[PDB]
Amino acid sequence: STGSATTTPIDSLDDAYITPVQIGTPAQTLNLDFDTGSSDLWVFSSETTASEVDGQTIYTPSKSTTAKLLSGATWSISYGDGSSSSGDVYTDTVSVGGLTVTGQAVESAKKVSSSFTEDSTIDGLLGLAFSTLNTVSPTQQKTFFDNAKASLDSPVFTADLGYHAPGTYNFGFIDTTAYTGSITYTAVSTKQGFWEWTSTGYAVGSGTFKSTSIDGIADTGTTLLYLPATVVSAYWAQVSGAKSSSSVGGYVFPCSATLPSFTFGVGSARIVIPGDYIDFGPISTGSSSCFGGIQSSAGIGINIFGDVALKAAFVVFNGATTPTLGFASK
């Protein structure tokens, strides 16, 4: 089997991408944030505290003839941005782009943190990291991809995120028309539950490539590119007037600037992020100070190849017995 679904930016900055997901019988379609940095499929629901729902579409398990409460199971998650959610668990039929999993754990939120409430466009998350990170207790549950894997034509999914435009998540096949050149595959460590890999270096604009190992995670659920402070300083030094602002929380730059590209290495291959992809717009409405899309990871503990990086590539998440990642230009 295969599946293919379009993923759409939630706003004009590509702050996140939403993909329609069918849950239950009859289907209830929710727009979920596919997140290769986490491993829970959780949704706003008829059980979510009413004051914490503000425009999201909810899953109502009592209206699904295939929903079954997973007795005694609860979940609770906290994400790298400080947001969190928790609740109980159903199993139900879940379909993405024509690919159906029966008995998928659907984590129904009873509580969500304010950042979720305040974002009416995201109805929940669909985790695509390794199932070892799933938070369901006392019996950990499998991700959608883990449940589908054995049925897929090939045990892979691909992320093809658009810049200011829709893109595609495919399951079970490589669309060889969706990229240029070849796909360069690189080793993955699953020891932390992530799609963790090592970039071979970087360049700023037309500058010389610096060969240096940068360990990080491929994370579709993170907006920006978080890299070591040395790398980030080298990038922003090429933008007149750019500076790190402690009050804003990162590098800012004059909105009048033209940003240079940023290249990252995948083995001997190179992925070029155009400068425009690094512009996240005014820090507050009407400001002439703009927020940068490349930020320091120094306070995170891990480097994160988020959407800024991934949307410059066609990315293969190869879930074979020994997982690997593939990157192609497009």
Q: Which of 174, 199, 219 is the last residue of a domain?
A: 174
Closest by CA to 169, choosing from 33, 330, 276, is 33
62 and 26 both lie in a single domain: yes
Question: Is 199 an annotated catalytic residue?
Answer: yes
* Candidates 35, 119, 123, 307; catalytic one: 35
Residues 228 and 326 in one domain: yes
- In a shared domain, residues 33 and 131: yes
| CA distances in angstroms from 322 to 187, 310, 319, listed in the order given | 9, 22, 7
Q: Which residues on adjacent β-strands are paired with residue 100?
A: 95
Q: Read out DSSP for 2-53?
A: -EEEEEEESSTT---EEEEEEETTTTEEEEEEEETT---EEE-BTTS-GGG-
> What residues does 185 pair with on adjacent strands?
326
Q: Which residues share a beta bridge with 136? A: none
What are the φ/ψ torsions at residue 140 (nearest 5 degrees)?
A: -60, 145
22 plus 159 within the same structural domain: yes
119 has catalytic annotation: no
**What gap in Å lies between CA 314 and CA 311, rounded to an integer?**
7
Give me 182's structure tokens. 């070849």
* Domain CATH code at residue 151: 2.40.70.10
The approach used to solve this structure was X-ray
Instruction: Note whether 326 and 160 are within 8 A (CB).
Output: no
Contact 265, 209 (CB under 8 A): yes
251-271: buried (b, 16+ CB within 10 Å) or exposed (e) per residue? bbbeeeeebbbbbbbbeebbb
Distance of CA 3 to the CA centre of its chain: 18
Whether residues 185 and 324 share a domain: the answer is yes
Is the same domain home to 76 and 169?
Answer: yes
Q: Closest Cα to residue 327, out of 190, 184, 206?
A: 184
- What's the number of domains the chain is made of? 2
Residues 6+ away with beta carbon under 8 Å from 272: 261, 262, 263, 312, 329
Give the residue from 127, 151, 174 where a domain finishes. 174
* Domain identity same for 150 and 199: no
Do 73 and 136 lie in one domain? The reply is yes
CB 163 within 8 A of CB 8: no
179 and 168 in a single domain? The answer is no
User: Which of these is catalytic: 38, 95, 199, 296?
Assistant: 199
**118 and 12 both lie in a single domain:** yes
User: In Å, what resolution does this model reach?
Assistant: 1.0
Domain hosting residue 238, numbered range: 175-330
- 165 and 206 assigned to the same domain: no
Q: What are phi and psi of 183, to 5 degrees?
A: -90, 125
Q: Of 29, 8, 10, give the one whose Cα is nearest residue 20.
A: 29
> Do residues 106 and 228 share a domain?
no
Last residue of a domain, one of 174, 207, 236: 174
Sequence positions preceding breaks in the chain, C–N over 2.5 Å = none
